[PDB]
Design a protein around this ligand. Sequence first.
Ligand SMILES: N[C@@H](CCC(=O)O)C(=O)O
Ligand SMILES: N[C@@H](CCC(=O)O)C(=O)O
Ligand SMILES: N[C@@H](CCC(=O)O)C(=O)O
Lengths: 212, 217, 212
Amino acid sequence: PLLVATRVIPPFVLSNLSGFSIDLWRSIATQIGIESKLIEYSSVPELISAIKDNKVNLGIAAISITAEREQNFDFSLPIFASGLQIMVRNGDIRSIDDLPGKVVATTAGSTAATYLREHHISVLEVPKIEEAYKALQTKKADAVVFDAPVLLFYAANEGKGKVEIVGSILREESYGIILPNNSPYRKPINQALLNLKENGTYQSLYDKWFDP
Amino acid sequence: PLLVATRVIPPFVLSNLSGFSIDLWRSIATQIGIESKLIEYSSVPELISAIKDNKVNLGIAAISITAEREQNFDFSLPIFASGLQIMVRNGDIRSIDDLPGKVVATTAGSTAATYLREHHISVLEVPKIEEAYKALQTKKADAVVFDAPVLLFYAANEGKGKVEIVGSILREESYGIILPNNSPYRKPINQALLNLKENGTYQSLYDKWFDPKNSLE
Amino acid sequence: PLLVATRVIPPFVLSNLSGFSIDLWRSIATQIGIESKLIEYSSVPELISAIKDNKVNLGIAAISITAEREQNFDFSLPIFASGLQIMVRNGDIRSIDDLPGKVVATTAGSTAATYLREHHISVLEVPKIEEAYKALQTKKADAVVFDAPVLLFYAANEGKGKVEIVGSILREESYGIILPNNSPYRKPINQALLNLKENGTYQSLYDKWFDP
Ligand SMILES: N[C@@H](CCC(=O)O)C(=O)O
Ligand SMILES: N[C@@H](CCC(=O)O)C(=O)O
Ligand SMILES: N[C@@H](CCC(=O)O)C(=O)O
């Protein structure tokens, strides 16, 4: 059976195991005709090490496809469109223009953390995005920078009436299923994914988590 | 010097060779240190066969990534977000629901011809994109179904005030660079494209050939 | 019980089920002592996928034996000699040389379709041949290219006085019973067919359906 590394980050991955990426991988696994075990990891870099250490066959959650990651690993066709975005409390912070000199929360080992560090912005790195939302509400942080879809999902729910997404996408990124190089499952994964997109399953799955 | 198959389809590929894909490939190639020679093909299947028979090293144009093509060929990361859309003369056709029982023109060997056939719609598969537009005017066809980006360009230009685009995207498709299986150029192309997006080059190219508001994410 | 895929296409397969291919299959099945269940399909490609999906054990109608099909599937010995033919309204169009720039109607998924596309002729691909004939009479199409035996049958029947078969055979094609690769029924069917061809049964069936 295929060993699949995952990471908790709603609405793509939730535990109690559910979410967009979970339903998607399952539809993909069945599409191919193989069984798989989901192994949770605390962060993206940990999930990546699992790939590099050959502990799992692939990884899926809300993994950004980046040049640096593509350099040492491989990816399937994109499974979702994302991008970095700023979120503030419900001001003096309206865009990236205002970030220098502020404290911004985000998850450790994320493309957001890397982007913030490159811009020399003071960062409060937390293990789970949920803790960043708390830092913002408690005012420990002045803003949050993370993947647009995740922030929007939050604003649409728990964050309702308590936050605001400001500015434009600071960095366009798409999600993908990460794999080791020369993986024999990349093509069957892409193949299945394309089928799901061509038969209407991807759409149904999309609406379930992003279209009420 | 790599042999690169291309197919004329504005505004991605134009010839008087320019266009969005022409500029994108040039950047990717210049960044990788690769030099190339572009070879023109008359249709998508004709371009695919050149790849299949090892007559070229890869191909780029407005090539939809599909399950069927992915089965025998490889694709880079998507280079564009596109999809099929309906176009009629400026009626009784406003959406997919209005196609069955009608005749829709499109290019032979296109994802649009496939979509139409599979949905049991009568399709006039022409060998030349321009002939599809004609078939609509001549009324030989009731409507045309083709890539949205291409129809918009034709509409805002040569077909301005003579045609109209209707309904939403029938099916979303992304374009990619098609490569032979196990191609050693796949990863470096992906790496190049990713950097081009990260440094803004991609963004600038897109805005050069398209209108920001029409982006399909 | 063997599942047999069929497609309605007179005079080989007609509904009222009869026709040359239907009578031939019955004689073959009776001889091999096999019980069969017929399943109708809307197009040749649909019938083919039924074979590929193991949804049927074989297929018989007016199925052309081509390299592309033989590469992915198998065939019995030919059950008929056919070929592509041009039909016009009741002159100028007489060969492929007059088809450039013309609209030629035929069924979607057929060898005629593939032939026309490969020769860069505009082809109106309809799901039902009946539409092809209508398009010709309505002048939407300038001609129709389809299987000679089928067009001849039409011209003698519903088409009498409104159509004309012109020119010679564009491309010779034989019909066969299509099967999945490694099919254990190929040889017995072949054996059965040969016995019918050798004891006069084939001749009788041929005369019954193709005698002027
Ligand atoms: N898309 C982000 C998610 C990071 C996280 O899950 O914390 C990345 O791949 O870096
Ligand atoms: N995006 C279409 C283009 C068809 C064409 O260029 O004719 C495809 O890949 O089929
Ligand atoms: N002999 C044709 C028949 C097509 C049809 O029945 O639609 C073929 O095998 O393609």
